[PDB]
RNA sequence: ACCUCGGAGCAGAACCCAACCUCCGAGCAGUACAUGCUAAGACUUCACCAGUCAAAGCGAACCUUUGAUCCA
RNA sequence: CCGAGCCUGGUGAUAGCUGGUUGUCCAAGAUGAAUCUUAGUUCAACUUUAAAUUUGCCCACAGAACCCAAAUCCCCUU
RNA sequence: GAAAUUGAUGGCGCAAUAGAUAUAGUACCGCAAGGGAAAGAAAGCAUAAUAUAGCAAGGACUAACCCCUAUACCUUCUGCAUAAUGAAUUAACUAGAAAUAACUUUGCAAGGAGAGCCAAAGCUAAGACCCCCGAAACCAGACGA
């Protein structure tokens, strides 16, 4: 009688682990629901995939988590939490490596 | 050349002495024999 | 008196009993591996001071089995290999 | 298309290959057929070398 | 499940009675194990197939010789019951290059520069 | 009874190393040597390999510890020398 | 017809003589002398294992019995004999129980002081 | 396929092949993307971006077609404004 | 291996012995010798002083065809070899005693 | 009775994991009509097919599941 | 020897099914998806050979989630 | 699966189970259509039955047996002494055919090839690689009450 059920897993999870290398538009994490939230130079896709928008280092972190205002379910949350109460996440990071450009030297006029 | 005096030492070139070039004559796998037998591959 | 199935996989197993003489090969594997946790207690170095001192070495090997790896190629070819085939017919003049 | 001492071109080749290769470059010397094969392109390079020294 | 296993710590942190059974000053620690396989790795973990053949020890009872540092530790601690570990022992220093070909170990675990 | 022959400090297995394989099997009735034995010579060439092994395993860690100390020396005198003003 | 073997007759007596001395029709058919010899080669290859096993214990009985004609058991002898740095070996052992007694009854008596 | 035609003992190709695959001469085997044409309405953007594209092969799928057409369709065409001549050929290729 | 050994005796080492046939060899490692009314026992060898043995190459052949097979049930596994070990015949020719007690 | 897809447990912590296994759901709708075009680099349901994400750029503006080929 | 005769021919029918597949010797070599599909096949994985050049495994620290255990992943050294 | 167009006496055979079916389309079989041969110049026994015990041997041994060791082979299976298949035995016969692309070795080489074809080191030549037996059937035409 219990039908269904035969889906195969996604695949999903972190595609880079920290101290990893990362290229710019390389998928870091893969998830159904933001277990990892987006850091520095990482970009978030429509189906909440953390890529790396600089090419450098992958490193995870936890950050205090102030919600975008507009969140309402997010803000209520916070308004039901007590004054000492701070609430944390884990936050993706790519460390840039190299250097957006350097000056050459092309004529000597 | 040193290869025609050593030709002037060596025995007549005959019919009897050719060879082919070594590496040039893989030598033919038939299924006979236990390793090429049986199920012969 | 019949142990049913067969003997040492089943739910029903024939009763086996433990001598005296495994008891002892046990003990003395025991102590001979407590004597190696002893002397794994005592690293000489400790894992920063060891990070790298072997650096040169292990890369010197590493550039050992690429050379061995390139350096793969076909072997010489020499005319007196294949004049030396014309002595099959020598003979006794 | 070699004639001579097909020996004496394969240590010619590797003093002028190795400089550039860093290493002295693997090679095959086929004396039957007057041929010399070397590991890796170099036919520019070789080409440039025969005409100086004028074959 | 079967997995690999994590010694906890403090099985590898000698004791006072440990350093009298055994002879092995903390301090000035020796420097080389004597290493020998005296357990096939047969009916082992593959993992375990894999650290002995890392260490040099596929054939039983031929000892090699190994540095006493952490990473060496760690296989040695993966594959502690495949194995006796011994400090090798020095009386008369390391082999000098005249003597390099005159020495023998014996099976106290002392490489003497005499035989 | 290899334990015995374990706690005296020889060989457990008498084949092992000692003076009843060590020693040449045979000389000349003239008394010159004989030619080393293919076995003698074979474990004389692993034995100096485990020599040679050892020197260089003890000589690299040494080596290592020198460095790490000259790291740790050369970080502190450079902090040191930072301060200059 | 092109190819046809002309050696048969010697490919077959190649294996046959090694069965001519075998029962029945396993020394004359080549159907049934083959797998014999087969087994008996196989036979013959893995008993050089069991002939110095069966030395080896036969030693160890003789030894037993010259021993316990002198009130040693097998094991004091050998141990003794160890621990005295006789590295006589059990072939050896028996030989001497056989022909040297009183050599054997020299070494008994060491083991047995050496026990004492 | 046949490997030996009865009317010429010459092995055939397979046009399904030859109408639906190109073959870039460097051994590469172009293909359109299925579906490309199909119910597009329901499609996301994206989606259609990536169905109107030009695809390439497998390494076993180019094996598979190489293995299917004959010498002809392997050869050197030099057509007037191929759209594909650059692509005919490898640059900078490293093993 | 040990051998029990007697003047005049035969001795079929499973080797070649890289001695040409006829020459004379002192065997050094000996174990055990002994008379009818006295025997002396090395710890574990006696010294040179003591005993001199001598032997003599008398043959350099090869053993028999030893056959090794190897035959393995509804696995077409079947494998034959022949082996002939090299042999050196040894004859004892004395054994010398010395005072060295 | 079921046959495709998806969610949860088995399968606790990277991924992956069956069943006549234990439960649940879907064959689209709402929205707008840039919900356009292009394009680095990636993910990928263990193959392929197919399916995802996407910087930069151009152009307007200021979106949240089902099915191939041929054939018409 | 008739739920559709016999003979010849097509015909060496076809058989994902059963059986068989003949010298010597050495070496490497073992448990997913789709499918009128699960007695088969194709792709993968594994495997073999040859070739190119350069890191591979092991691997501590750091690191990998909220909701509501054994371990695993990742990699400096070694 | 085209066409236009192009134009071009011998035996690395068999030798009486082979080679023709063939000494013969005979003998023989069939009502008939039809099928269709054979052949000419070791095994098995006997000399000489047999001796406790055992995959019939091996290690051996002074000695055949006695002692010790040893669960036929093939195939099919996860796994077979298996009480799963096949085999009385001897002789003879009886089963891996080939392309695409590779690789190796030659030749020549920005060209190769004895027209056509290929070519961004290629082209030309050679070498290596793809089994045997078996249905119930289907259809055509004969032959049979
Ligand atoms: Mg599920
Ligand atoms: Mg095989
Ligand atoms: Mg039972
Ligand atoms: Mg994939
Ligand atoms: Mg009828
Ligand atoms: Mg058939
Ligand atoms: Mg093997
Ligand atoms: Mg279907
Ligand atoms: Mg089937
Ligand atoms: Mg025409
Ligand atoms: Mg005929
Ligand atoms: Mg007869
Ligand atoms: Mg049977
Ligand atoms: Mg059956
Ligand atoms: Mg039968
Ligand atoms: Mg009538």
Known sequence: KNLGGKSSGRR?????????????????????????????????GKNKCLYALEEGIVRYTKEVYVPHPRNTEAVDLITRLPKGAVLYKTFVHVVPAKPEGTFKLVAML | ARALDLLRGLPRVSLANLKPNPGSKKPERRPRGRRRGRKCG | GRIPGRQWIGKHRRP???????????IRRLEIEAENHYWLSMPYMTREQERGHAAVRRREAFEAIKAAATSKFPPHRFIADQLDHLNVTKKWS | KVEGDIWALQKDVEDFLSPLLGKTPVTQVNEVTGTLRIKGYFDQELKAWLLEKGF | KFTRSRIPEKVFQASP???????????????????????????????????????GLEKAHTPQVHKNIPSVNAKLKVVKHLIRIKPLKLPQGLPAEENMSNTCLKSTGELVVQW | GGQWRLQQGLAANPSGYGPLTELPDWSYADGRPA?????????????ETFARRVVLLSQEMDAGLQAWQLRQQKLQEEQRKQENA | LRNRVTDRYFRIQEVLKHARHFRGRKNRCYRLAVRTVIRAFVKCTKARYLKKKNMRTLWINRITAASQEHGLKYPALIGNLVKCQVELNRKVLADLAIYEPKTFKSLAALASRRRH | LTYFSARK???????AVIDRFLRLHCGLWV???????????????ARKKRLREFVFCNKTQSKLLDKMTTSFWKRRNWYVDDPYQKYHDRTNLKV | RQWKVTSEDLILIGNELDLACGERIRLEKVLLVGADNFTLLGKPLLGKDLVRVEATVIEKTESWPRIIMRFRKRKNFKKKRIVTTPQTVLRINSIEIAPCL
Do not use: C
């Not at chain 1, 920290?18 to 970009?43: C, D, K, L, M, S």
């Open chain 1, 12 to 44: 999903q999870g972190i595609k880079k682990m920290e101290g990893h290398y990362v290229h710019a538009g390389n998928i870091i994490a893969t998830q159904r629901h933001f277990r990892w939230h987006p850091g520095a130079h990482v970009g978030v």
């Open chain 3, 16 to 26: 086996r009993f433990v001598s005296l003489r495994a008891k002892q090969n046990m």
């Open chain 5, 17 to 55: 009675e440990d350093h009298e059974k055994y002879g092995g000053d903390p301090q000035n620690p020796h420097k080389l194990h004597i290493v020998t396989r005296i357990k096939s790795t047969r009916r082992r973990p593959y993992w375990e197939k894999d650290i002995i053949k890392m260490l």
């Open chain 6, 35 to 47: 030619p080393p034995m293919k076995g003698q010579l074979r474990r004389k060439a692993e034995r």
């Open chain 8, 9 to 15: 003992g010459k092995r055939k190709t397979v046009k």
């Open chain 8, 31 to 45: 293909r359109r993307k299925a579906g490309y044409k199909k119910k597009l309405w329901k499609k996301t953007p």
